[PDB]
């Protein structure tokens, strides 16, 4: 059966400014089947208040979802997105780089 690996991007809604409210996003796209696990991490621990968009797909039938949560960036706190899917032998972790 068809299986496509998810592309992953971790970024903020607005340019990051320490001490100012924002939203941390993790966009997963181009995957199949739709079964997928996405977590946002703060200094390694799982953030519990995370929401996501309603499942949708592109013209080529691949799925996409946006996971997000409110956050206020600091100079020292580090964030990341952890994803697991049938195409990944191990959970894939991508660190947030305020420049990407």
């Amino acid at each position: 059966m068809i299986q496509r690996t998810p592309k992953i991007q971790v970024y903020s809604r607005h340019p990051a400014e320490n001490g100012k409210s924002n939203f941390l996003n993790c966009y997963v796209s181009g995957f199949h089947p739709s079964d997928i696990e996405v977590d946002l991490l703060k200094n390694g621990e799982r953030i519990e208040k995370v929401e996501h968009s309603d499942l949708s797909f592109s013209k080529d039938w691949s799925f996409y979802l946006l996971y997000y949560t409110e956050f206020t960036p600091t100079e020292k706190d580090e964030y990341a997105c952890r994803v697991n899917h049938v195409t990944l032998s191990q959970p894939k972790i991508v660190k947030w780089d305020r420049d990407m």
């Binding site: 059966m1 496509r4 991007q9 796209s29 739709s34 309603d54 797909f57 039938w61 946006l66």
Partner: protein, 275 residues
Amino acid sequence: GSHSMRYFFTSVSRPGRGEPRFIAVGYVDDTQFVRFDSDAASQRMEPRAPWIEQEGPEYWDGETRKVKAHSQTHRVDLGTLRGYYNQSEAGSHTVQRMYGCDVGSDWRFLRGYHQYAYDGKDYIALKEDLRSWTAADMAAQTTKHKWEAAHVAEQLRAYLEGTCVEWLRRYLENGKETLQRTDAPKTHMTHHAVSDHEATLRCWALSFYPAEITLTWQRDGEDQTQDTELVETRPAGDGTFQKWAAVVVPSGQEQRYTCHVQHEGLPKPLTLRWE
């Protein structure tokens, strides 16, 4: 400009874990406006954009009734295809469906779509003449024959050219402040030394709508497609989109490169340079 309305449906089986989950979403251009989730508590079609919240109870009761009919049918469709392909009842499978219409700058019908995919593969689709069907395998042909005998294409055509376009026009007018607008991209560049003789130049496009956009890097006026890292356009979460393009430049040659941005919200294409 041109516009479109599209509905996306996803049905996924989960043997030994209850009935299949069904998710439906509706879009006007790149703006979602409704949703339905068979696992949710409300069991109703729900608004996902401010401009559709004004529709009365007749609208919501009607879309709820129709969407649950779609759910029940696509839930059953999973069983039908498992049979067509003689697959076991243990595995999880996926049925996807999409239909909608396109309208030109003059707001008149341009094209219509109605197609399905099983486990990520094209299954059946209405052709451009709005009268015939494309079926790749034996199974698809069985569905194709049923639909020809039931004259499905004809009923569908009346929806695509009439009803579909009529509602799209209505939504465009009722939500004109957001649907008939354009947010030009806010741009900037970043420079980061990766070594003592090489640096990364990244061109940014932020807070734009619609999603369609073209971002390119040129050196001395020539395209650098193969040397440019371009990420997929992504949602900001507030209704706008973002995108960036980067090239690694030999320290000292920054002035040879230019970033070009094309977007409907720009009065003229932009040409940026690091300087």
